[PDB]
Enzyme design. Sequence first.
Site, mmCIF file in Angstrom:
data_model
loop_
_atom_site.group_PDB
_atom_site.id
_atom_site.type_symbol
_atom_site.label_atom_id
_atom_site.label_comp_id
_atom_site.label_asym_id
_atom_site.label_seq_id
_atom_site.Cartn_x
_atom_site.Cartn_y
_atom_site.Cartn_z
ATOM 1 N N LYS A 1 7.238 5.753 4.014
ATOM 2 C CA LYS A 1 6.739 6.014 5.329
ATOM 3 C C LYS A 1 7.583 7.123 5.973
ATOM 4 O O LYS A 1 8.794 6.974 6.222
ATOM 5 C CB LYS A 1 6.797 4.782 6.191
ATOM 6 C CG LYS A 1 6.335 3.528 5.487
ATOM 7 C CD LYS A 1 6.343 2.364 6.465
ATOM 8 C CE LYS A 1 7.768 1.827 6.629
ATOM 9 N NZ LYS A 1 8.188 1.709 8.054
ATOM 10 N N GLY B 1 0.746 5.819 9.716
ATOM 11 C CA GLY B 1 1.555 4.944 10.549
ATOM 12 C C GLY B 1 1.579 5.413 11.992
ATOM 13 O O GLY B 1 0.930 6.416 12.357
ATOM 14 N N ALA B 2 2.323 4.679 12.813
ATOM 15 C CA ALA B 2 2.435 4.992 14.229
ATOM 16 C C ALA B 2 3.049 6.386 14.468
ATOM 17 O O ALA B 2 2.458 7.199 15.187
ATOM 18 C CB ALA B 2 3.231 3.917 14.945
ATOM 19 N N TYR B 3 4.207 6.669 13.863
ATOM 20 C CA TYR B 3 4.871 7.983 14.081
ATOM 21 C C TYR B 3 5.035 8.823 12.806
ATOM 22 O O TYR B 3 5.968 9.655 12.662
ATOM 23 C CB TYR B 3 6.166 7.884 14.906
ATOM 24 C CG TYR B 3 6.796 6.528 14.973
ATOM 25 C CD1 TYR B 3 7.266 5.922 13.832
ATOM 26 C CD2 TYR B 3 6.947 5.857 16.185
ATOM 27 C CE1 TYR B 3 7.871 4.678 13.878
ATOM 28 C CE2 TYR B 3 7.548 4.606 16.249
ATOM 29 C CZ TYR B 3 8.012 4.020 15.086
ATOM 30 O OH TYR B 3 8.624 2.784 15.099
ATOM 31 N N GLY B 4 4.055 8.630 11.927
ATOM 32 C CA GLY B 4 3.903 9.387 10.712
ATOM 33 C C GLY B 4 3.115 8.646 9.672
ATOM 34 O O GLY B 4 2.548 7.585 9.908
ATOM 35 N N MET B 5 3.144 9.206 8.493
ATOM 36 C CA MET B 5 2.222 8.976 7.448
ATOM 37 C C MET B 5 2.849 8.135 6.355
ATOM 38 O O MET B 5 4.037 8.259 6.148
ATOM 39 C CB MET B 5 1.893 10.355 6.897
ATOM 40 C CG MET B 5 1.066 10.391 5.664
ATOM 41 S SD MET B 5 0.747 12.115 5.218
ATOM 42 C CE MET B 5 -0.215 12.635 6.644
ATOM 43 N N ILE C 1 -1.609 7.080 1.535
ATOM 44 C CA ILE C 1 -2.112 5.728 1.720
ATOM 45 C C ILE C 1 -2.740 5.604 3.071
ATOM 46 O O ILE C 1 -3.848 5.117 3.154
ATOM 47 C CB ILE C 1 -1.029 4.626 1.576
ATOM 48 C CG1 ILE C 1 -0.599 4.491 0.133
ATOM 49 C CG2 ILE C 1 -1.640 3.305 2.021
ATOM 50 C CD1 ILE C 1 0.669 3.664 -0.051
ATOM 51 N N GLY C 2 -2.073 6.027 4.129
ATOM 52 C CA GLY C 2 -2.600 5.876 5.468
ATOM 53 C C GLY C 2 -1.695 6.452 6.489
ATOM 54 O O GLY C 2 -0.675 7.061 6.138
ATOM 55 N N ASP D 1 4.596 -9.089 17.286
ATOM 56 C CA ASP D 1 3.372 -8.336 17.034
ATOM 57 C C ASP D 1 2.808 -8.769 15.720
ATOM 58 O O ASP D 1 2.318 -7.945 14.943
ATOM 59 C CB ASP D 1 3.567 -6.849 17.081
ATOM 60 C CG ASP D 1 2.296 -6.048 17.310
ATOM 61 O OD1 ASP D 1 1.321 -6.518 17.806
ATOM 62 O OD2 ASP D 1 2.397 -4.829 16.918
#
Length: 346
Positions: A44, A24-28, A21-22, A139
């Site tokens: 995730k 993330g900050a510290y993985g996929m 899908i995409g 955030d």
Amino acid sequence: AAAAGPQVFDVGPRYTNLSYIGEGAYGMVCSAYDNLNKVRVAIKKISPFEHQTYCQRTLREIKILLRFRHENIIGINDIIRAPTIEQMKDVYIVQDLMETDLYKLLKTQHLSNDHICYFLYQILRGLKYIHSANVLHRDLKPSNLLLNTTCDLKICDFGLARVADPDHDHTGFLTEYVATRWYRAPEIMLNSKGYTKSIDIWSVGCILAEMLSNRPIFPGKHYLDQLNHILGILGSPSQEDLNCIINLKARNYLLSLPHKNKVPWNRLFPNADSKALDLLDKMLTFNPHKRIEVEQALAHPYLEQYYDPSDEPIAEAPFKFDMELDDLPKEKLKELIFEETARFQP
Ligand SMILES: [Mg+2]
């Protein structure tokens, strides 16, 4: 054994059939078929253990998401990790599969006024629960608003979230800040650490403006630029609002600027519903003490089709951190992460 553009996505026999899908900050993030529930889910992969700050983000997020239970807040369905600390290199968080997020959706789609009203209502409904737990998300932005195909909206990404601490909100002029620049309230640049509920309402106002035009309302290119965008639309703060800023350096900065008049909302957003713009104004109020609170926003006329306080639940108790995560090493945070994720082991 399954791999997705290496890397290893080992989510056991339960989850198969992975699809990217995409990132993330510290993985996929991938989708996966849940062989038990017979639905696709989102997974995730998080590999945070080499950075203290990644670990902090991860711990916050897990702790808060496991405690919260609300229709407009993403839930954690499962967490997959190794059976021992020694063997744990990665953690996989499983959630309901959402179709998109508001960031990706606004890249190509115009929202109808009914869509903006409904999404706003859901953001605020979820935020009422968060704030009722004495938690600040800190955030909020389009990419942290997940959407499914039926327009259900779920707030995600609590990696910067904190317990509210208004007594300790004061700081000096130009204090560094981590949350996404475009959605920062003006006081962050002036005198605030972002430890009050009002920080989140400003972000929701920025999100409402972005739903009305498909463009960020205050796209600062850098730290002080952010303030300058905000003031370019709101105009110069009133004397009463300046007097509310005691920080001399911040007050004098504002006094140094030439007078600017307010840009009227109906000019910036000529196609918008008038009641939407009235609520926008109240969320994007300069003085954080005068800014609308979440429950008042829900009661605003714009949201009359949906408002029902009996169907806008609150948390059963305040949220607290056992310990201050700010102080804690890489290694201790890994330990707590292991403990927090234990309930998902067979
Ligand atoms: Mg995010």
